[PDB]
Design a binder for this molecule. Structure first.
Ligand SMILES: NC(=O)C1=CN([C@@H]2O[C@H](COP(=O)(O)OP(=O)(O)OC[C@H]3O[C@@H](n4cnc5c(N)ncnc54)[C@H](OP(=O)(O)O)[C@@H]3O)[C@@H](O)[C@H]2O)C=CC1
Ligand SMILES: CCCCCCCCCCCCCC(=O)SCCNC(=O)CCNC(=O)[C@@H](O)C(C)(C)COP(=O)(O)O
Ligand SMILES: [Zn+2]
Lengths: 126, 114, 95, 208, 340, 86, 134
């Protein structure tokens, strides 16, 4: 036979070694990262990402540094599709919220529209 | 839904392996209190073994509980052989940590964590 | 030109000084608050404004490769001197 | 392209292509993909049931003789449904050659241990248990090798954070080295360094 | 409430607990575990030390960087106390001696120094001042220790109105002089007592419970002006207590009574050298002094601290004295001492 | 002590809210004139089951499932809410 | 005074003028002892003895769904029909139009940069007002 049939849910929360507080009380976020509007390049809007909620950063009294207690504060995971991220978050027991992929709609670009006859879209200078 | 097992074909053999592991830990605990010369009683160590087994009493997947039995026997191999020390055994007793606020009101009083 | 707070504590060139009720002065109890008494904003005020007859002046801070990258400064504003963004040496066109 | 660009070895590329065809058609039961990179290295991407029949082949076939197990490796890629990727780097001292044998697993599927082929793997896949949680069935002494004895979790998985979950300190009350939950005096600062411009058009993927 | 002392973090090591503590006498037995429990919350702990700085080395891993500030002081110097307590929001005093010396007798250590510390903490605006007296403090007491400590308690109260005064009965731990006093009299001849030590009744208290009570009194605003009496959960006689001490240590026990006729003279027999005296006549008068029961004063359970008995920690204290032939033994070996 | 507000959840495209829509096109206006200072919050959503939340005094909220009902059944349930006043 | 949280400083559902409910994400934490707003209100209910049936933010949003389910359905404009019935309810009582002409409170660029408690406490907005009054 050399196979079994597991009808139950794929769940590995007892195996990862993560404490319970960083399983149930966190909120994973599954999102295509938004385009840095400083830059027209769109290679940062390709792959899905999973972050978590940002917990407390406080002042270190010695140096003024950003001390923190959240271990998962720097954990940003990369997933090629959305449902892989959803299956990964269901697999680890993380409660997740999903933003959809915001794509720009195609615009009607016309260079002659800058020099129309009766339309308002004449440019005032070039 | 056809996956490959580890040791157990279903939940009954898996519970058999959990039960043999519990038998082995229950035999091991008096020697663990003795040779490590811990400062707890034997009954307190058996209570901690009971708590660590009841922590994972919710899983209905045979591969996950097979891996839990494998990891528990690795813990037992590191316990029978003196590979762990007094510190690694007493890490199961979260003693130096303060008890965390459990109710909403004291968590509201001390911090931002829900 | 370091100035001293009313609590008796020196003030850095940033302006950082602990308040009177702040407990974090206790790290200086029996010890010293190390500040540098050569303020950069006061040592750059002492530099003379360089008169040139050009319209655009190039500055690398002196030393060639031992200074900063060579940048070009416009001096069309007869009101305001052209301060270098790296070294702070300010230039004025003499016309 | 003479001074800076690396000189391409086309002879080794053709020879590894021919040997990859050779291995792909001798073992069609397990071999999924065969690929040769630009710098002429061969990968035989196989099925995880074929750990023993491939590696015993390459160790014992007279045209392969991959006698030395150089490096056994796991790679965590969480976007795949079999996230862990087991890599066998093999050296044939007879034919002066190097091959790579790659396969897959998830957290729960046991990979067949290769100590009956290469005893060199006796620690390596043990490390793959210690770092990745990949279980290896019929291993002689499978346990942790690199982490602390009471350490909970598998560190080199990518869902495991850089700093752990517990840290140590000596405690004078209990006169003992204890583990508290980890707190940093300074947070590990994350540098978002990905340039938003496509660096390599040759590795462009087709869109959805 | 200044912004730098606002409590942050999860209460771990590198957090900000909002407590700035000047712990006088932190180099001793109680101050060790007090700085241990304060620095694991992330408290600014000022340690004024009198001794060699090497004897403060064990205080350095007890907290995060910049959370312990070591500084010199003199007992007869109000300038050093003003230099120390001026930034703190709590001052805990722990200066004590089991014996009187050439330079410091009991009137200096218990009456003069805590009154000076509390006066300087008052005129520098310190919010909380905690004093550690002894449960058997009595003006009419037969021992100089308890008389001077009751006088100093009265003076700490009358110069600091919100002083939290704490009465431990008999503190035991790894570095105590209560169970280690009992366990290190074996080769002297058979543990001498008055009337076989069965006319005095004690209830010892454990040092982690004392420390939890002190720190939960730091964090309680309702402990201002109160007077606490930290006692154990069970009251023993002295004889069955020494029975239980030598029975946990797995030692032979051959007692004999020792009356007034020469057991006050073993004091002047055993401080003949200028070292630490192994026993003194004040320690004689205090071992054979029963612990009073004060129901009106609050205790550990009125601060939410569970009093841990001796049958859980006596093995931890007294495993050091077992030779080798009963080192590897169990806690289920000794039948416990009878309560009263 | 009495009814304080009514909430009516429904949908635009679901047939299960259909008679509930037939309650609002025909029988809401003379409802609102009969209850001048009773807030009756009509909430249209994407795929919810229809619902009748009746909040009473001291935060007591009672729940009626208006799924797949006709206009007369929704009218009878709402007038039983108006008549009961728990 | 109960010190609350700000929009960068809490996870929080705001609904724009078109009905599209949208959640903010926690960027930083509130300064000092200041806590999140509904945390404060829920703890006040726990003090007074009128404890509300929610403990976590998801339970607040389940209550918020019970009030209206178009508050927890994010980036979604739920189309609101029944203009005719609101019109027929509008024609009941004739309130009369005043002869004061319609003047907005924000006539020029002077009146834009200081509207709420955050903008009036801003030195950038203060420089903007000082630089548009000249
Ligand atoms: N069984 C007990 O321990 C009990 C103790 N107490 C009280 O609790 C307090 C702490 O007890 P404990 O730690 O065990 O005693 P210790 O003698 O071990 O500790 C006393 C501390 O105060 C310092 N100190 C002592 N004498 C002087 C002095 N003359 N001038 C300046 N500093 C001095 C010591 O430092 P240094 O090395 O410089 O001397 C040390 O840090 C004391 O006030 C004691 O009376 C009350 C009830 C029971
Ligand atoms: C000193 C202390 C030493 C600590 C020792 C730590 C060892 C911890 C080992 C952990 C391994 C496990 O948790 S195996 C448990 C997994 N089993 C399951 O999920 C199946 C459910 N099992 C149960 O309910 C078990 O109680 C039983 C007995 C197998 C079946 O009981 P049912 O009846 O209900
Ligand atoms: Zn320059």
């Amino acid at each position: 036979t050399q196979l079994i049939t597991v009808d139950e849910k794929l769940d590995i929360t007892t195996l990862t070694g993560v404490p319970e507080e960083h399983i149930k009380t966190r909120k994973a976020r599954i999102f295509v990262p938004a385009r840095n509007n400083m830059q027209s390049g769109v290679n940062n809007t390709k792959k899905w990402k999973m972050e978590f909620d940002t917990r407390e950063r406080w002042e270190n009294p010695l140096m003024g540094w950003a001390s923190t207690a959240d271990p998962l504060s720097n954990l940003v995971l990369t997933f090629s599709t959305k449902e892989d991220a959803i299956a990964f978050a269901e697999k680890n027991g993380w409660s997740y919220d999903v933003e959809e992929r915001k794509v720009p709609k195609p615009k009607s670009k016309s260079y002659g529209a800058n020099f129309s006859w009766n339309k308002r879209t004449r440019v005032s200078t070039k | 839904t056809s996956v490959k097992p580890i040791f157990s074909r279903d939940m009954n053999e898996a519970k058999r392996r959990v039960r043999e592991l519990y038998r082995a830990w229950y035999r091991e605990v008096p020697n663990t209190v003795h040779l490590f010369q811990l400062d707890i009683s034997v009954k307190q160590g058996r209570d901690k073994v009971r708590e660590m087994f009841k922590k994972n009493a919710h899983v209905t997947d045979p591969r996950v509980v097979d891996l839990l039995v494998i990891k528990g026997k690795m813990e037992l191999e590191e316990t029978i052989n003196v590979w762990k020390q007094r510190t690694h055994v007493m890490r199961f007793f979260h003693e130096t940590e303060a008890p965390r606020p459990k109710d909403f009101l004291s968590k509201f009083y001390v911090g931002h964590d829900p | 030109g370091v100035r001293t707070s009313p609590t008796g504590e020196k003030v850095t060139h940033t302006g950082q000084v602990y308040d009177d009720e702040d407990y974090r002065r206790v790290r200086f109890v029996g010890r010293q608050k190390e500040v540098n008494e050569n303020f950069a904003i006061d040592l750059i005020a002492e530099q003379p404004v360089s008169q040139v007859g050009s319209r655009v002046i190039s500055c690398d801070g002196g030393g060639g490769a031992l200074g900063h990258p060579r940048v070009y400064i416009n001096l069309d504003k007869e009101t305001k001197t052209g301060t270098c963004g790296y070294c702070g040496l300010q230039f004025r066109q003499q016309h | 392209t003479r001074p800076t660009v690396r000189p391409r070895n086309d002879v080794a590329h053709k020879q590894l292509s021919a040997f990859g065809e050779y291995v792909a058609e001798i073992l069609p039961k397990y071999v999924q993909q065969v690929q040769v990179s630009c710098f002429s290295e061969l990968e035989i991407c196989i099925h995880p049931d074929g750990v023993i029949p491939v590696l015993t082949f390459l160790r014992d076939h007279s045209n392969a003789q991959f006698k030395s197990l150089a490096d056994l490796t796991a790679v965590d890629i969480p976007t795949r449904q079999n996230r862990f990727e087991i890599v066998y780097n093999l050296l044939s001292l007879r034919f002066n050659s190097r091959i790579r044998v790659k396969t897959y697993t998830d957290e729960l599927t046991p990979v067949e241990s290769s100590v009956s082929v290469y005893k060199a793997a006796n620690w390596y896949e043990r490390e793959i248990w210690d770092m990745f949680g990949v279980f290896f069935a019929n291993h002689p002494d499978l346990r942790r090798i690199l982490t602390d004895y009471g350490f909970e979790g598998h560190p080199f998985r990518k869902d495991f954070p850089l700093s752990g979950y517990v840290e140590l300190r000596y405690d004078d009350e209990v006169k003992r080295v204890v583990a508290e939950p980890v707190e940093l005096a300074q947070e590990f600062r994350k540098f978002d360094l990905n340039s938003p411009w496509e660096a390599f058009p040759a590795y462009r993927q087709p869109p959805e | 409430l200044h912004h730098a002392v606002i409590p942050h973090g999860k209460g771990g090591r590198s957090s900000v607990s909002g407590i700035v503590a000047t712990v006088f006498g932190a180099t001793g037995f109680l101050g060790r575990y007090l700085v241990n429990h304060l620095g694991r919350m992330g408290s600014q702990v000022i340690v004024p030390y009198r001794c060699e700085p090497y004897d403060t080395m064990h205080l350095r891993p007890m907290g995060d960087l910049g959370q312990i500030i070591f500084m010199d002081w003199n007992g007869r110097d109000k300038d050093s106390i003003r230099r120390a307590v001026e930034h703190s929001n709590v001052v805990i005093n722990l200066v004590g001696r089991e014996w009187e010396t050439k330079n410091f007798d009991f009137e200096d250590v218990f009456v003069k120094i805590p009154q000076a510390i509390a006066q300087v903490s008052k005129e520098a605006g310190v919010e909380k001042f905690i004093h550690i007296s002894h449960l058997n403090a009595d003006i009419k007491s037969s021992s100089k220790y308890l008389r001077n400590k009751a006088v100093g308690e009265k003076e700490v109260r009358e110069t600091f109105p919100e002083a939290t005064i704490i009465k431990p009965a008999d503190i035991f731990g790894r570095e105590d002089r209560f169970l280690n006093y009992f366990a290190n009299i074996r080769w002297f001849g058979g543990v001498p007592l008055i009337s076989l030590g069965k006319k005095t009744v004690k209830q010892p208290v454990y040092i982690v419970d004392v420390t939890k009570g002190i720190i939960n009194a730091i964090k309680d605003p309702d402990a201002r002006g109160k007077t606490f009496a930290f006692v154990g959960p069970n009251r023993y006689l002295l004889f069955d207590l020494v029975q239980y001490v030598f029975a946990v240590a797995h030692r032979p026990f051959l007692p004999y009574p020792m009356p007034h006729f020469a057991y006050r003279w073993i004091g002047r027999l055993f401080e003949i050298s200028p070292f630490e005296p192994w026993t003194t006549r004040d320690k004689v008068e205090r071992i054979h002094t029963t612990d009073r029961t004060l129901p009106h004063l609050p205790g550990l359970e009125d601060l939410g601290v569970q009093a841990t008995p001796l049958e859980l920690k006596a093995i931890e204290v007294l495993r050091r004295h077992r030779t080798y032939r009963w080192l590897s033994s169990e806690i289920e070996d000794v039948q416990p001492a009878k309560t009263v | 002590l009495g009814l304080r507000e009514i909430r009516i959840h429904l949908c635009q495209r679901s047939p299960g809210s259909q008679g509930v829509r037939d309650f609002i096109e025909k029988r809401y206006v003379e409802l609102k004139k009969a209850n001048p200072d009773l807030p009756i919050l009509i909430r249209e959503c994407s795929d919810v089951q229809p619902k009748l939340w009746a909040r009473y005094a001291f935060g007591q909220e009672k729940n009626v499932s208006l799924n797949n009902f006709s206009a007369d059944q929704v009218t009878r349930a709402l007038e039983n809410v108006l008549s009961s006043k728990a | 005074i109960l010190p609350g949280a700000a929009y960068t400083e809490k996870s929080a559902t705001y609904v724009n003028t078109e009905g599209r409910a949208q959640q903010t994400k926690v960027a930083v934490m509130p300064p000092g002892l200041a806590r999140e707003d509904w945390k404060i209100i829920r703890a006040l209910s726990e003090i007074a003895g009128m404890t509300l049936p929610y403990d976590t933010l998801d339970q607040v949003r389940n209550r918020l769904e019970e009030v209206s389910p178009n508050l927890v359905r994010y980036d979604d404009v739920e189309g609101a029909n029944y203009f005719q019935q609101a019109s027929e309810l509008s024609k009941l009582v004739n309130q009369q139009l005043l002869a004061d002409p319609l003047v907005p409170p924000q006539l020029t660029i002077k009146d834009f940069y200081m509207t709420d408690s955050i903008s009036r406490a801003s030195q950038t907005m203060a420089k903007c007002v000082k630089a548009v009054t000249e």
